[PDB]
Design a protein around this ligand. Structure first.
Ligand SMILES: Nc1ncnc2c1ncn2[C@@H]1O[C@H](COP(=O)(O)OP(=O)(O)NP(=O)(O)O)[C@@H](O)[C@H]1O
Lengths: 801, 223
């Protein structure tokens, strides 16, 4: 109620006069800004919306509601010197311009303005304008808090102060930090936004010193001693600067307290009440009462749609021939209609997030271990989609340009042999031409295929981009289920995508897979997908590997970069992390089950730029982020429940054996051991992707190398056709297999379903052997045990002879 | 006759652009540059519609738009990380013979920073890494030039050293950090200096590891 009175008072103070309806409007605005913000559920907000109107019209009869209180109520001070109502569009334009300025001023990361973030900007600004205005932003991990607070603080000129808690950071250090910020805010009259985060608010012992500041603006006992004399001197100097002559120490201290009320603000940032393990649990209700609480929530369908459109607008997702489907599935009810290709693609990009949320909820329903899904997952997905789209389009354009160059050189060679026919070498030139033209025709059809590949690129990248971003924690079966759901939804929207996509093949060249297998990579579909996730990651990865193979894989891959091993449990962990961040060597950190919170900004990449010095806070220190730094978090425990704070800051990579993973491994082993012809026809079905065509045109590279090396010596024997015949064979061969890609697929399906009960029996047997632990402590058997049993049963079986 | 009008109204914009380009590179403040460029763009937006059809107006507007776009790289080029060596690297890779004292904003502007953004990004990345290593060595130098061995009186016979745990922890941290710095890709520039400190750091350990022992036994024997 006192905050309500203060809000109306600050609204009315610069105003010379008002009508009654403007007073009612300010009253309703303060009601919404004090009560509707803290609410979590949308229907509660609707109830508050209706009840404000009801109370107003009950106690202010004969005042017309339309003029007095319109639903889009906004008050702002940026447009005009007075705190008066403003329209949505003008504020949108101003904030957009200032945000585009903010991009190239303090932090170079795009920040989309959607309907549910402009409101938070206005709320944060409002609490900044009030006296003793402290904000408590509570909401899902990510979503803008610690980025909107910094943004509005920059806009309003408030120098941002953030506490840097070290180990052995006694209460005296917090006392000294509070002394410094209080001296700056009160004596020097420098507005400060005192930002505090749950990471550095791990200890609740120091958060009750802050309650006195929040409630009164002065914390007695801070400046006791000679510090009182120095603060009195500086305070009287500041008062003289402001033009007030004060003598008594009590009056000077009161004026200092008033200045601290006016200037210093506190911005707490918290996650919802999932921090039961912390000493806070639910933090004290006094802290909730002292601050103004703001529920950030999670991005709705419209927010995802808008933050997707303005991140994928630079991409060329335009198709003039996009036939809209007769009945489309929609997540965004306000999609433009009839939707275009860009609109449909962004709607599908939001379908990815919605289906992933539904899948995680379903996994929670069946008792499985769920993982928090946050807006940063969507941002990472969109970034991966953009990078992958650019990469694949660049590759295809390069190949098409090279083939056009090849056609030019083929025509040049045709001209050369025609010149040589102007001149018994001459007779066999009729044969070489008969080869050359054929090759030309072949290359022409190849060019035509590239056009079709263009038409298929966009959706394909989508179905891969999501896979790199979202389905990293899930098991193989749910990975495939999610991929099938996404593919079906893309098919429903008439977005063109490859029918038989291989994720592991579409995202990696065979040289990279060979290099990984040269390293300690167990060669499986799940393991190859995970290895790809360790290559195309924007956020640092979390490797859940009970076997321990993946740590050795990472170590062997990055040995050239001098990667070093560390663990959280190690005493010399923080200093090793400091060295790795300072110098840029890659790092692997093990046993992240005991995750230290000091790594929170490092995973979030919260670089603070000052001149050429790019600082990041770690404990007491502010260390210089070297460009080369990369960190890989690791977990030998596969049974872990990470906080939602860490999930948004890291991408998961699960090297865990499950029923379907072992089933697939065993089935592949049987197909390799007992029906090697089907193994060849299966590996050849995943080589009709990039491998064989890449080799087919890499032979054209050597052809064109040895095609223009001519000074009339092309007909040394009129037997250059051999080099042109070596490409005549393989083409037809890789044209046969492309034609025989449905017969082979059906054949491998029919032959693999035959050997499937053996695979299910294998998975059941191994998981029973794993279950044997809780019968007796000695009954412990590794997966190497079962795989050695299977090698004996398949290869060293005398009964099969 | 409208050619005269567009040329006369674009002449002032050309004078201001050239006056900005003539500014020496040392005195450039990129934020003030953005303010001036925004003023110029808003001035250009107010021309009559008849003038706007011409190709010269479009060319000048595109030019100012490009300067705004590369203002980010201009800010990054005022980074304190860049040194004489990094300016030499930029000169060599971009094939330009600049003079750092005599460099002007216009010479950097007319050099295709937009096309060559990859080279600029690489050089400033190397500059950031070397700045990190340099400031780490600065921290070592300041700390060990300002470190005093605390002394506490012992039975009015002498003053024995206190704080062995802190001293050895700091020495261990610095030795480990220098050993990790030896692995850095940007280490070759500072190598000799690092080696010097390594020697001193080892000597410091090689002293105090002995010293505490010579203290402890003596104290014991004294007792
Ligand atoms: N509206 C937005 N548009 C685009 N990117 C955004 C937006 N809001 C936040 N981000 C990005 O999301 C990432 C994390 O945002 P941030 O709000 O700082 O996380 P957080 O809420 O502080 N997590 P935590 O501090 O542990 O509570 C950063 O890379 C931001 O740039």
């Amino acid at each position: 109620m006192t905050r309500w009175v203060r809000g109306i008072f600050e609204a009315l103070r610069p105003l010379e006069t008002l009508p009654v309806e403007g007073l009612i409007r300010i009253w309703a605005h303060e009601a919404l800004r004090l009560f509707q913000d803290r609410l979590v559920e949308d229907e509660e907000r609707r109830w508050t919306d209706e009840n404000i109107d009801t109370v107003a019209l009950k106690h202010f009869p004969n005042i017309d509601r339309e003029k007095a209180m319109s639903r889009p109520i906004l008050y702002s001070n940026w447009l005009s010197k007075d705190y008066i109502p403003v329209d949505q569009e003008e504020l949108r334009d101003y904030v957009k311009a200032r945000l585009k300025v903010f991009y190239e001023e303090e932090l170079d990361v795009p920040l989309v303005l959607f309907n549910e973030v402009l409101d938070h900007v206005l709320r944060i600004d409002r609490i900044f304008r009030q006296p003793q205005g402290h904000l408590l932003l509570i909401g899902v991990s990510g979503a803008g808090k610690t980025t909107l607070s910094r943004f509005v603080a920059w806009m309003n000129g408030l120098s941002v102060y953030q506490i840097k808690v070290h180990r052995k950071y006694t209460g005296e250090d917090f006392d000294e930090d509070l002394r410094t910020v209080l001296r700056r805010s009160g004596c020097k009259n420098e507005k400060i936004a005192f930002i505090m985060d749950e990471s550095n608010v791990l200890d609740s012992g120091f958060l009750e010193r802050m309650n006195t500041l929040l409630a009164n603006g002065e914390v007695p006992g801070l400046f006791e001693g000679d510090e009182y004399a120095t603060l009195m001197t500086q305070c009287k100097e500041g008062a003289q600067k402001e033009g007030l002559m004060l003598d008594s120490h009590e009056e000077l201290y009161k004026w200092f307290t008033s200045q601290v009320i006016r200037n210093l603000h506190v911005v707490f940032t918290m996650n919802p009440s999932s921090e039961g393990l912390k000493d806070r649990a639910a933090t004290s209700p006094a802290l909730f009462n002292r601050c103004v609480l703001n529920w950030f929530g999670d991005w709705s369908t419209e927010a995802l749609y808008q933050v997707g459109k303005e991140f994928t607008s630079k991409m060329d997702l335009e198709k003039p021939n996009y036939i809209v489907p007769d009945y489309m599935p929609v997540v965004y009810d306000k999609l433009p209609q009839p939707p275009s290709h860009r609109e449909a693609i962004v709607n599908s990009c939001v379908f990815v997030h919605q289906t992933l949320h539904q899948a995680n909820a379903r996994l929670a329903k069946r008792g499985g271990r769920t993982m928090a899904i946050t807006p940063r997952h969507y941002l990472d997905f969109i970034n991966h989609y953009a990078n992958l789209f650019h990469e694949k389009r660049s590759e295809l354009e390069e190949q098409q340009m090279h083939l056009n160059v090849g056609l030019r050189k083929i025509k040049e060679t045709v001209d050369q042999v025609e010149e040589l026919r102007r001149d018994a070498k001459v007779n066999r030139s009729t044969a070489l031409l008969k080869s050359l033209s054929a090759e030309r025709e072949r290359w022409e059809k190849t060019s035509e295929t590239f056009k079709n590949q263009m038409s298929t690129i966009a959706g394909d990248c989508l179905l891969s981009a999501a896979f790199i971003a979202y389905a990293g924690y899930f098991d193989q079966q749910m990975r495939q289920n999610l991929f099938t759901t996404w593919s079906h939804h893309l098919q429903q929207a008439n977005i063109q995508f490859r029918t038989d996509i291989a994720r592991t093949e579409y995202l990696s060249n065979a040289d990279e897979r060979l290099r990984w297998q040269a390293s300690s990579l167990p060669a499986d579909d799940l393991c190859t997908e995970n290895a790809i996730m360790l290559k195309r990651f924007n956020r640092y990865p979390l490797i859940i590997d009970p076997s321990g193979q993946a740590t050795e894989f990472i170590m062997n891959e990055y040995k050239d970069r001098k990667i070093t091993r560390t663990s959280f449990l190690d005493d010399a962990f923080r200093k090793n992390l400091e060295s790795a961040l300072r110098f840029g060597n890659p790092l692997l950190v093990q046993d992240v089950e005991s995750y230290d919170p000091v790594l929170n900004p490092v995973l979030n990449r919260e670089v603070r730029r000052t001149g050429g010095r790019v600082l990041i806070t770690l404990g007491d220190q502010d260390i210089d982020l070297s460009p080369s730094f990369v960190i890989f978090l690791s977990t030998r425990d596969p049974t872990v429940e990470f906080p939602p704070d860490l999930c948004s800051r890291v991408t998961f990579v699960n090297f865990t054996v499950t029923r379907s993973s072992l089933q697939s491994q065993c089935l592949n082993e049987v197909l390799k051991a007992e029906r090697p012809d089907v193994d060849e026809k299966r590996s050849d079905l995943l080589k009709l992707q990039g491998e064989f065509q890449l080799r087919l045109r890499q032979l054209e590279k050597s052809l064109l190398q040895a095609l223009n090396e001519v000074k009339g010596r092309i007909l040394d024997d009129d037997t250059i056709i051999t080099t042109l015949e070596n490409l005549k064979r393989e083409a037809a061969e890789v044209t046969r297999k492309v034609e025989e890609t449905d017969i082979v697929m059906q054949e491998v399906e029919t032959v693999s379903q035959q050997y499937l009960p053996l695979s299910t029996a294998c998975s059941s047997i191994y998981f029973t052997m794993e279950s044997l632990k809780q019968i007796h402590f000695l009954y412990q058997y590794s997966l190497q045990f079962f795989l050695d049993i299977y090698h004996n049963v398949l290869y060293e079986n005398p009964n099969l002879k | 006759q409208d050619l005269k009008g567009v040329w006369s109204e674009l002449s002032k914009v050309w004078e201001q652009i050239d006056q900005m380009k003539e500014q020496p590179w040392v005195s450039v403040q990129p934020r003030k540059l953005r303010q001036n460029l925004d003023a110029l763009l808003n001035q250009l937006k107010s021309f009559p519609a008849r003038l706007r059809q011409y190709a010269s107006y479009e060319f000048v507007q595109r030019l100012l738009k490009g300067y705004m776009k590369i203002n980010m790289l201009v800010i990054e080029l005022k980074s304190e990380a860049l040194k004489d060596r990094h300016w030499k690297q930029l000169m060599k890779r971009l094939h330009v013979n600049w003079v750092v004292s005599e460099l002007t904003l216009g010479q950097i502007w007319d050099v295709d920073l937009q096309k060559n953004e990859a080279i600029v990004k690489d050089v400033l990345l190397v500059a950031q890494g070397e700045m990190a290593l340099e400031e780490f060595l600065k921290q070592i130098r300041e700390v060990w030039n300002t470190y005093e061995l605390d002394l506490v009186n012992y039975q009015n016979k002498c003053r024995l050293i206190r704080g062995w745990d802190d001293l050895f922890n700091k020495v261990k941290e610095h030795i480990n950090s220098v050993s990790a710095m030896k692995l850095s890709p940007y280490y070759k520039v500072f190598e000799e200096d690092a080696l010097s400190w390594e020697d001193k750091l080892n000597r410091i350990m090689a002293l105090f590891d002995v010293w505490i022992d010579v203290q402890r036994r003596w104290v014991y024997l004294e007792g």
